[PDB]
Symmetry: D2
Subunit: 229 residues, 4 copies
């Protein structure tokens, strides 16, 4: 009864809600976090980017809950002498949601505990070394579930995140095409009890806070779909 | 390079840009023009509604022009002892476009003259009686092409509008599922020379201005898809 | 619970069920009816072409009925001195369905009456002059509903046919891009009472039987989709 | 230029090519290997099932290579006092491909050696214990790459396999929705140099050959899409 779908290989401001350092470069890359004119990634960067149309995630009258999927290509690069930090995340957030905290909290949470009012589901790619990991975030930066991630700088990473409303299972996977490595994490998420009926979808990324802990957080392409019975 | 598509059988304020008298009823109907609590449509009404995400329909860098398609179900009803006016339209408009003049101008134009700066492509369902018609509007309310439309009050109408950027052909069709009647009109439109690179997509409708010329202009469901470098998949 | 979808801008034998004169040319056009080496369309030609996978149209256990849509581009050309005949049709037919009669019966019917066992729904583009028309065919070549069609030779025609299982309305439209003319016809069809649960979809075309009544019947591209709850 | 996609939550003989022990139960489950009427899976079973329409995955004229994606839910169950064997696989095979050897060879190969003429790309779920694994097979049962798979009997498994022809990267993943466990493996495959222009897509599965190594190999639902010149839309 409701469907939404979009796909961009080249980003443009016009149908995005850009928050903070998120820009679309002249080459149409969604640079979530800031890169200076020298071409260097800057510390303490936070960017979020959302599709301009909200998505219905469930309907209280029917009790129906949406399924959804998103894929994107990201490039996280780290200059020599630096380590990576902090990562990026794909997020579903309430309509009108504004960025939260930088660094390890990814513009998503304001603390390291459970927060039922966060109404946040996220899959984060945590470049901060608990080893580097992909985490499923349900109302918490403390992933209810993680998997080790062998992060490699400068290599495009392709992500797929799916949520099945019937099983309630959220699945996130990352692949490095050029390195042919891959990582996956899955856990159940009751969206109905976590998210509002309508959400915005997109990204959030942060760079490290301390020198030598920095990265680019570029989304090179993005696709999203959701279906609500 | 770019794809957008959405589909709603029940509307909601949340992902729409509603303009003027356009409302979403508690039944989830998109009522483009005003209906009073006594259930009657009111005169001098205009409403518009758009999907909230802008659609890219071309880029000058590559010279690619988008193809697109939309379908919707509408209900135009007329109170007893009234005639219908004025119609509704599906439109592609510059991002940020706002309602224009009432009545015969359909919220799309300010005059009856050709206007190159309108950057307007619209498919109009004209209920004002030149017989009642569906018209393709390019930068004018004087449709560049029309077909007769045997309008019938209170009957759900299913519309499909498609544009193929290769042929520059715009096609609009209306069917009354319960009367089994159908109408179609087509003409080339050079979107690239008419519309800006990005557009909003949605509807506009007006009621008549003099007593006994009025109608509901309800949209019951809506789908849209566009691709910038497949209608079957779409309907 | 069931979906099927395909789209080809260039045909290939490999995923088609070609019946009779239907060929795929070296340029990947689906030539439903025969064209000789001289480049002339031949009389008494019949071709049908179907997608190789059957499509479920309804389910007797649920009583659910599929919606479906198809679009295609066709080019019907007529040599000088000839008139056009007979047309082509998009069809839904029982799985394993074999061509019926040539000429005015379009490879679809064996008579000009109602036949409940035909289990055939068709939209025909009748080039035979009742003026030339698009017709909706439900178990009969005698369209339950027609609309005048100003046929023009050599001009690509773009067709869309949709069936909505909720209203039961079948709609067929034709447009000539280069001429910007268009035609449409709609009527209700109870598929459940007409078609088997599974069907094959595709085309049928015929050329005239008598000299000076001939045409090419080329499908240049084709898309189909169907959904069954 | 070409797109194909289908999706079934309930299977039916009608649009499938079923091979060997593969059946569709009255509940509409795709049972790739044999289950007796006492409900128990039997030894030395092999079954395959394919979508009936061939898929174009490249053309040499233009040098375009298809991208594709498939998802499916499977259930591998083991009787008490048995271990599992041998697994199931999703496969792309030449049009007309037929089942190969049983057991560890999964109906995909005849030997344990590399075979360039196999024109086989497969993602295998190996239940035979080298720990139980998911493996990418290119012209060999000796997976060019594997990952450990913590197989659990009787639990529905959701698989997703994708191929991107730009990167030549094949990715396969399995999740157990009720155990919340998940596994993934990826490697480049040059489809163009491995597979023919057209392929059939579907599944293969085998049970063990010695007593106490057996399993069900049920597919409960399946989706496939391919494009020859969008995973999100697909799942
Ligand atoms: C985005 O679209 C606008 C047209 O509205 C264009 O001028 C601009 O170049 C585009 N940006 C990118 C990064 O392509
Ligand atoms: C629209 O969604 C909101 C939740 O944001 C809900 O409260 C409201 O009932 C919906 N409107 C309709 C007409 O269903
Ligand atoms: C169809 O596909 C085959 C490859 O199996 C190819 O050899 C042939 O040229 C193709 N036909 C057309 C008309 O493109
Ligand atoms: C498959 O479809 C046929 C109709 O062709 C039907 O009789 C049968 O019940 C279906 N099979 C299943 C398992 O639902
Ligand atoms: Br931009
Ligand atoms: Br929505
Ligand atoms: Br860098
Ligand atoms: Br590093
Ligand atoms: Br921090
Ligand atoms: Br971990
Ligand atoms: Br809400
Ligand atoms: Br840090
Ligand atoms: Br993407
Ligand atoms: Br609302
Ligand atoms: Br406004
Ligand atoms: Br207003
Ligand atoms: Br009236
Ligand atoms: Br304006
Ligand atoms: Br004027
Ligand atoms: Br007229
Ligand atoms: Br613009
Ligand atoms: Br008036
Ligand atoms: Br609609
Ligand atoms: Br061929
Ligand atoms: Br089907
Ligand atoms: Br000719
Ligand atoms: Br002629
Ligand atoms: Br005849
Ligand atoms: Br007629
Ligand atoms: Br049947
Ligand atoms: Br004749
Ligand atoms: Br087409
Ligand atoms: Br069956
Ligand atoms: Br076989
Ligand atoms: Br057999
Ligand atoms: Br076991
Ligand atoms: Br073989
Ligand atoms: Br061997
Ligand atoms: Br391993
Ligand atoms: Br081939
Ligand atoms: Br064994
Ligand atoms: Br599936």
């Amino acid at each position: 009864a409701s469907q939404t779908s979009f796909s961009f290989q080249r980003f443009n401001e016009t149908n995005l809600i850009l928050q903070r350092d998120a820009t679309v470069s002249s080459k149409g890359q969604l640079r979530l976090t800031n890169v200076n004119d020298n071409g260097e990634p800057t510390l303490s960067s936070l960017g979020r980017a959302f599709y301009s149309a909200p998505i219905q995630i469930w309907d209280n009258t029917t009790g129906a809950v949406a399924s959804f999927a998103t894929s994107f290509t990201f490039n996280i690069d780290v200059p020599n002498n630096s380590g990576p930090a902090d990562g990026l995340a794909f997020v579903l957030l309430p309509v009108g949601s504004q960025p939260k905290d930088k660094g390890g909290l990814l513009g998503l949470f304001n603390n390291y505990k459970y927060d039922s009012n966060a109404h946040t589901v996220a899959v984060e790619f945590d470049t901060l070394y608990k080893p580097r990991h992909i985490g499923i975030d349900v109302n918490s930066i403390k992933s209810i579930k993680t998997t080790t991630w062998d992060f490699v700088k400068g290599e495009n990473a392709e992500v797929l995140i799916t949520y099945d409303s019937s099983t309630k299972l959220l699945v996130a996977s990352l692949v490095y095409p050029s390195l042919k490595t891959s990582f996956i994490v899955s856990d159940t998420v009751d969206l109905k009890s976590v998210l509002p009926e309508w959400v915005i979808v997109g990204f959030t990324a942060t760079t490290g806070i301390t020198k030598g802990n920095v990265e680019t957080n570029d989304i090179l392409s993005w696709s999203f779909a959701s279906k609500l019975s």
